[PDB]
Each structure stands twice: as C-alpha cells, then as structure tokens.
Amino acid sequence: AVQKVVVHPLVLLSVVDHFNRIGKVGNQKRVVGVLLGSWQKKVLDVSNSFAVPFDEDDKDDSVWFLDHDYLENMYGMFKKVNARERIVGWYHTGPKLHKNDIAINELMKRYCPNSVLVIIDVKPKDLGLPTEAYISVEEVHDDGTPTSKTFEHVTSEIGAEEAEEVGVEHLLRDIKDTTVGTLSQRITNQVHGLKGLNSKLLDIRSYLEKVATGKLPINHQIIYQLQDVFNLLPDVSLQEFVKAFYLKTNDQMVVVYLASLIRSVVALHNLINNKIANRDAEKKEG
Template sequence: MPGPERVVLHPLVLLSVVDHYNRVARDSRKRVVGVLLGACHRGVVDITNSFAVPFEEDAKDPSIWFLDHSYLEVIFRMFKKVNAREGIVGWYSTGPRIREADLDINELISRFCDSPVLVICEVQPNEIGLPITAYHAQEEVREDGTEKSKKVFLNVPTEVGQTEAEEIGVEHLLRDVKDATISTLATDVSAKVQGLRGLFSRLQEIRQYLEYTLAGKMPVNHEIMKQLQDIFNLLPNMNAGMLSKSLAVKSNDMMLGVYVASLIRCVIALHNLIDNKEVRLGKKHVDKPKDKADDPKVEKTDEPKAGEEDKQPSGSKK
C-alpha cells in the first residue's frame, strides 16, 4: 500500500498531546506515546482526535520498552462507539526525535491499521515553525544490493487544519495571548524575521545533509537530490542587471512609502499636541473667570462713599 502524501493535524490533537506530556513526563527526559484517530482519503491523512496509551522504556537500553496494547484496544472500542468514522491512523510521540524503538512500535501499531503514520510533537520547540513532524515507514532497498531491505522513516508534508468550530475555540484560547498594543507593522516585521530564521535553519539542514553525503556518512537519496536541483533551478540569477535594478526600484518605492507615512504620523502627533494645549488653556480661562469684586481696579458701588451719609435728606429714615 502506498504511503500517505500529506498529513493534516487538528488543534485538538496538539492540545491533547501537550496535556498528556504535562500530566506524565513534565520536567523529565521521558516521552509519552499515544494513538492518533482520524481518516485517510486519497492519500491525505486527516487526524482529528487522539488518546494516551501507557508507555514505558528503559533509558539505558532503548530496545526495552512496553506499550499496553490491551488498554489501546479497550479505549479504541469506546471511541468507536462515540464516533464510528474515526479509525486508528497512526501514533504520536513527544520525541523530540526518532528513536531506535520507533520502528518496533510502528510494527505494533500496524496491527490496527495499514500504513500508520508517526507524528512527533515537540512540546518544547527550540526552532521557529510548526512543532510537528510526520513520518511514514517504508521499505528501502540499497541500489548496490549489499544490504537487505529494511524499513526506514520517510518525512511526510504536514500542516495544521481546523474546522469552523475548532477555529472559534482556538481564537478564544489565543484571545488573551495576543497583545493588542502591538501595531500591524510590528507584527508583519516580526513575521518576516521568523520566516527568515526558519529559512536559515532549513538551509543549514540542507548543507549538513550534503556534507554528510559527500563524506560518505549518509547514502545518496536521488529523490532529495532531485528536489534540491529543482530549488537551484528556480533561484533567480542575481547577476542580471535588469533584475538587480528592478529589486532596487521596488525596495526604494517601499521605503519611500514608509518614510512618508512616518512623516505624516509625526505631523499629526504634533498637531494633536498643539490642539490639546490650546484646549487646556481655553478651559483654564473659562473655568476661572476674573471676578469684578476681586479686581482692585473696579470700584465697589454697593458701599456708600465718604460724605454721602451726610447729604441724605432730613426726612429720610436712617
């Protein structure tokens, strides 16, 4: 049976794996193992659910391990009653890398499904990018015929997919994580930086693979060489004068737009500062008007002047 072409992982599976790790192996060098549930259609493995399985392995001897497959069968029957469409499509491990016993564990999982996939979830990722990597076991035959065929893990393209209900739940979970004070420009620049860091790490992996292949430490894989040749053929020729000029013009236009936008923001900020100052001064003048009674320049007309009391008519009452 041909292997899967693509693996789609749902957010619920990631949350379940992290919860399983925090409950069992947090602050330790152990790893946890579980079963992946979903469906496979036209080469695409859609992983929608998962559950944990009791697993132990010897730290000194990696060939000694234990996985409770009886527990696996009981829990799977219970999940089957809830959703009959979900079947076992593979298993997960918190890795963070492939280990020696993974091929044997994969053989055990293959009793419950054809062509199981292994998804390694890094609960504490050190690199930028998706913390998941999917693999599929396939028979490999050496071209020179010096060795017998053996199974090896091949990488499978992986992505994160979600339904409408899951998207709403993820947005609620990430609502408090997102900082609303960060501008859109800062977010875009941060995304560009993360993308460049991810590209740099992938280029380092390619360089390391080519060095190992040249030194004879790893066998030559013609499929990888073909993909690398396609990448090199798609790279633009930076020595062409027209391309360099076009890139320079495009960069200058973008920087001009950023510069003009910065000037406009500065002018608007100064304008608002002046308006705010004028409003504050106007309020101060309105709130504290000068009282005529307190003004020494204004004469008080209510009190009689000296000598006016004597000029009153004799018939008037005092």
C-alpha cells in the first residue's frame, strides 16, 4: 500500500522544536504529533507537519489523549493555505515502540484510512536513517489468530528537494565536499564491516535467543528463507571459487591496465613542467 517515503528534514526539525517545547515541562513519556503528507504515487512525501498535546499514564496503556478538534482546526488552516498537503500519519520521539501505538494508529486511521508513524531520535548516535515507516495490515497468521493486527515495516529514507539545503549546508559549514580520493571509502569500510556484522552478530544473538528462549513466534517462515537468499553463498572452507579466481583476475585486468598505462602517462605529466620550471627557477633565480 506504501511503496516508500520521500521525507524532507524540515518536518524533522518541526519535530525538534516541539521536543524543545516539551523538554522544559513535566515530560511523562514522549511526543505524539500529527504527520501531514503529500501522497501522490504509492511512494510518499511529507512537506510539513505540526504537533498535538499528549499524556499517558501506564496502568493499562489506554489512557492517552489527543485533541481532534484542534487537530482538524489546524488541518483546515494548513489545508486552506496549502491545498497540496493532507494528513498521512503521526510520529513519536521514543525510539522503541510500545503496545499503545496500535491504539494510536487505528484511532487516527479514521480520517484517512492509512496513518504511517515516524520513529525518530532526538539524541541519535548509533542508528542509520531516523525515518521509519510501518503499516498496519494482516497476514493473519499461520495459526490464523483473531485479528493479529501487525505493524509492517515499510522501507524508508530521507527525501530530497531542490534548494531546501540553502539553510542547511550554509549552517553546518564543516562539510568536506567531494572526498573521493581520500578516506571516505575506509570510513564506509569500518562502518559497514563492523556496524553491519554487529547487526549480524546481534542477529545471531537473537539466534541465541531462539536457543535459550524464543518459543514465541520462533518464525520458521521468513527467517531461514531470506537467510537462504543469503545462503546463495555457503562460504565454507576450501573457499569453493576455483571458478572465480580467473574472474577476479578479469576484475584486476582492466583496472591494472589503466593503472600501468595512465600512471606512466602521469609521471610523463609531472616530469616535463617539473624539470623545465625547476631549472628555470634554479638557474634563473640569480
């Protein structure tokens, strides 16, 4: 129902300012505010949003409060001043969801029949992209339970829009543009090796959760099947790529030919002007 999102950072800063509005007062749990959107294709876009007050006691996670009158009033405001927008969901600032969130979702899926949430983090350090998307559909179950209404993790990204970075890249000021040729590749090496194989090792920690625990949905439906998509390469010892060392030599082939020829021509670049201007400066210096 949702293909992916195209989410601008402006709405994230529009979360940040209301986070500032709640960091100064008695903060019980978190922020629940409105997420407007510009839904055009099965892809999604958001240009703007606003918040709504919210409190929640924790006794039966059912005591939680919005103001639909205020919501539809400021929706009428921003709909009049901009007829492109409409509501598309909500957001929350606490990075881990909880069981009240389905009640939030289905209670605001009455205006438009879809309401995608947005996890964010006001103090992000370890995550990748803040923007996250769920959708509430049913697969019902293998055991076909009475309405196993599940959030379904839709893919996400940070969006892009022309000249919205006019403030941004002027503000941050620290950007080393076009570090191709230096150390960006090894930053990606450190982070993708370590920070992806730790995702892998926490997947195998979840496998240890399946060992000592994990009766719950032990999930022999999607786990080993997408892991069989991984297991397209069962890379055991003896390494099994006698039929790929020549292909690796073919990979080395053209680039090393370019390296040999071209860097010989690069020495040929440097030496000419270097010698000529060198002895020019040297014996015409006096």
